[PDB]
Design a protein around this nucleic acid. Structure first.
Lengths: 96, 95, 79, 104, 105, 95, 99, 79
DNA sequence: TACCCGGGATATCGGATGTATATATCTGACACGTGCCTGGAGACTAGGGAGTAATCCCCTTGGCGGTTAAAACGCGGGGGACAGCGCGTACGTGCGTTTAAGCGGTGCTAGAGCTGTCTACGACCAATTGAGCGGCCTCGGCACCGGGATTCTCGATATCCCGGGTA
DNA sequence: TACCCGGGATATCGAGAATCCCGGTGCCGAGGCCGCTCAATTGGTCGTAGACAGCTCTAGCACCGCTTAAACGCACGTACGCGCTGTCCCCCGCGTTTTAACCGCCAAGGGGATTACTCCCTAGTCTCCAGGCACGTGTCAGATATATACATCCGATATCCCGG
């Protein structure tokens, strides 16, 4: 029964996803979330497909830059585990 | 001796209308003047951008209203749009 | 309510793209919160532009103008 | 010779706002509802900030608004802080903020 | 005698279209002639630099068609193009292959 | 069927002049078009601001030159000002 | 015996004293010499209004005070109370000022 | 060379205004570096505006326009 | 080996230091009046940007069948985050010494800041034509399936050199 | 005690899962050709924006003398940074089972967009005049010296508690 040590598949995935360019969030649940959030601003809103694709591109770019800053906060705290402490520190130093 | 325009007397008028006994120094008057210029430029900028987006060449009250709803955060937008619409009604129905 | 559609593997993939090796368990709800706030800011502005155009369909140009106003310029969708 | 400020019930000049919207090269045409509405908005923001600043001057037992009072008036309100987050006010300093972990 | 100003100025980007965008865009009352020639020259130079670095990164990837990923690498591996486009998201580009040192075994 | 203007053929011409064998996809062409529009708007914006500061109403080559020296970081500014001045000389001394 | 406080008490006393004041903390004249020295490397024989140097000093002090605020939050985050150049570099990197 | 005119007590006062309780010794040189880089960026832009106005005196409006371009709007000096 | 006395952690009040609250003085900066002039206002006309109606066809939404990649649910374990401990070193506090930053003057002059003149450079208008865009097409570069080389991971195993109780 | 037994850490290899490279095949989007239409160009005309000369007078820069405020340096001690170690629990890899994301195909209609037509709102001119600004003058808000009260905060100490 082969089993890797903890850490090796994580680093393998870090490499696989830093080489790839495809969208990581699934398309349809993100679309439902966007329509749900829009609902609380105007009823009966329609959406071009490219509008939801643009929202998804920008949302994923934002969350990836956020996890990069969060990883730098974790490393700064002598840890290899990201924590909600780290996300809150990142957004605070970033000014959000 | 070129007359430099300012908002100083108008800020002083609104200060007397909100606090009749409190005066104001000249440095705080400079800060209020720069605040007024800044917010002016911000709103007129966003309104010009809105007019360019919609293939229009006339800045009307609707552009300023949507610029205020974009730029002011939340409750400041709600009260200012109300105040602004009030002043345009009083303007369009005056003698 | 559809915020759970942002699954735990999807947040893990996003973290992998950011280079994160190890992820604690309380991250996922926190991340759902932050993404929810981001889309709130962006879609509000986009809906405002739709309101001003007297239209009922939110175009991609509206989302581009909105992200650009917020200082996050997106290339590849026009404009 | 009734000015447009008094006609609209305002204090900020509608004529100066209108000629700054004309000279500033923002569009080809500029209406009449636009400078009235914009003077109204500007008057409201000046009113709100000078109100909070007179309050902070009263708390400090003074009857003259200084820069420090504008600083406190802006940074203790949430929406004016969001409005003026990227703005430095000179001669204002900062809020009296001391972190909890530094206290004995 | 219908020689265009693009060819007259030794450039490729249209000086006429730049000039009519400076007029339509409501930037000033008067617009000279040196302004759209100079601005078309600047725009041509930046497009040249970006497509140069992007063809290099496409060649290094053994590809003959520049994709978004190649523009991403071309911009983010250059320092001054990164300073120019620091707050700009390129869609379908991803990120650089960056792994921190402390995470390695 | 309204003709939507673009910079696509001009980007393709400069690509053939810098890499004769490499083509380009349509998504990268959209990204280059948006890059050109963006840098255009940035430079024309800063130039308009410069003209308003100096109480001027004419955007000349000097305004675009100082806008480029402000907006482009370092060596990109040095090479582009050179290239731009070259094109204005060739323009002002042509037939 | 000569009286002496423990480490920390005068620091907190000064924190309170300077968070109440609004005056400029850097001396005027050495900052002016630094500003003229840096300007020298861009154009020779430049002159400066007095308000120009005061504006430079106002913005520089506001910038360094916001920077030390973020640096203190990084230090506290690392279960420390002493700021370090690691902390300044982390702050400037996350804030985007590194380049 | 005049960068030492930014003294150790002045950096300590600035840190006190930021709320810092304890300061390590390597801070001071690091801070001299960061301030030097900040003024470099700002004065370069201000000098550019002076160059464009064909003048020899750097006005306060030049420094205000420069700080504003860099996203740090300064109130109280005109504009 | 029992009494007396030395070290350590955690409440208490004296007492030393800095700090918030009471008067007196003196200022100089804010508030207010005056001349005046330049930008705001009133009136009138032209036209072209914008509102509105009709049309039409694009594309956005809703629904169904399958199928298959992905998400959800649990096992087991190690490895990393979290509480406890000691060192040393390097900062913070206070004391004397001393370096220079501020204040107050005048002198000078380079250069900002206005005024009048005047031409050349750009807006505006009409003709014309060719460059740039919609539509079409074909074909080769990219996507994709499969196999082999390779490339790092991880366990099993032989081997090793330092100190607490077995035979 | 010197034993042969026994826990910590090192190098070394070989199975083994994963990934890169290499051919082989299809397919669809990028490059290229053609009509045409509308915006780039050329020629001409005024009007005024800006370049230029001259004058002024403002403030920006060098120069000295006191004056303490603050920077500099040194001793010292203690409190915090950091390394070590021990625990445990939480997250990570992996197998199995569920499930909804995706494709693809089709259908109905909402509204995006386009064109035409009228009409009225603003740009522009001209004339008049009064509100806003520069300038001058008073006066009191507050900055500045000194005087006692009112919180901390640190050490002597008050007593608890073991120990060499």
């Amino acid at each position: 029964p082969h089993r890797y040590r903890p850490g090796t598949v994580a680093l393998r995935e870090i490499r696989r996803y830093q080489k790839s360019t495809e969208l990581l969030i699934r398309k349809l649940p993100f679309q439902r979330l966007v329509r749900e959030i829009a609902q609380d601003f105007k009823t009966d809103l329609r959406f071009q497909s490219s509008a939801v694709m643009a929202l998804q591109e920008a949302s994923e770019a934002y969350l990836v830059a956020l996890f990069e800053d969060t990883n730098l906060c974790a490393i700064h705290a002598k840890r290899v585990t990201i924590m909600p402490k780290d996300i809150q520190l990142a957004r605070r130093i970033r000014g959000e | 001796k070129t007359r430099k325009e300012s908002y100083a007397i108008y800020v002083y008028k609104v200060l007397k209308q909100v606090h009749p006994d409190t005066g104001i120094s000249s440095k705080a008057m400079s800060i209020m003047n720069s605040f007024v210029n800044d917010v002016f430029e911000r709103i007129a900028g966003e309104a010009s951008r809105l007019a360019h987006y919609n293939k229009r060449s006339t800045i009307t009250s609707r552009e300023i209203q949507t610029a205020v709803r974009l730029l002011l955060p939340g409750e400041l937008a709600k009260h200012a749009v109300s105040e602004g619409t009030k002043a345009v009604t009083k303007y369009t129905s005056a003698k | 309510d559809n915020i759970q559609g942002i699954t735990k593997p999807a947040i893990r993939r996003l973290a992998r793209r950011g280079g994160v090796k190890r992820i604690s368990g309380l991250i996922y709800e926190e991340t759902r919160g932050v993404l929810k706030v981001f889309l709130e800011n962006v879609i509000r502005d986009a809906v405002t532009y739709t309101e001003h155009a007297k239209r009922k369909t939110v175009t991609a140009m509206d989302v581009v103008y909105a992200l650009k106003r917020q200082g996050r310029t997106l290339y590849g969708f026009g404009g | 010779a009734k000015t447009r400020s008094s006609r609209a019930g305002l204090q900020f000049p509608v004529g100066r706002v209108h000629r700054l919207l004309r000279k500033g090269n923002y569009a080809e045409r500029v209406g009449a509802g636009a400078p009235v509405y914009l003077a109204a908005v500007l008057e409201y923001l000046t009113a709100e900030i000078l109100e909070l600043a007179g309050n902070a001057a009263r708390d400090n037992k003074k009857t003259r608004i200084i820069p420090r009072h504008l600083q406190l008036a802006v940074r203790n309100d949430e929406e004016l802080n969001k409005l003026l987050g990227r703005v430095t006010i000179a001669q204002g300093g900062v809020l009296p903020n001391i972190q909890s972990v530094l206290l004995p």
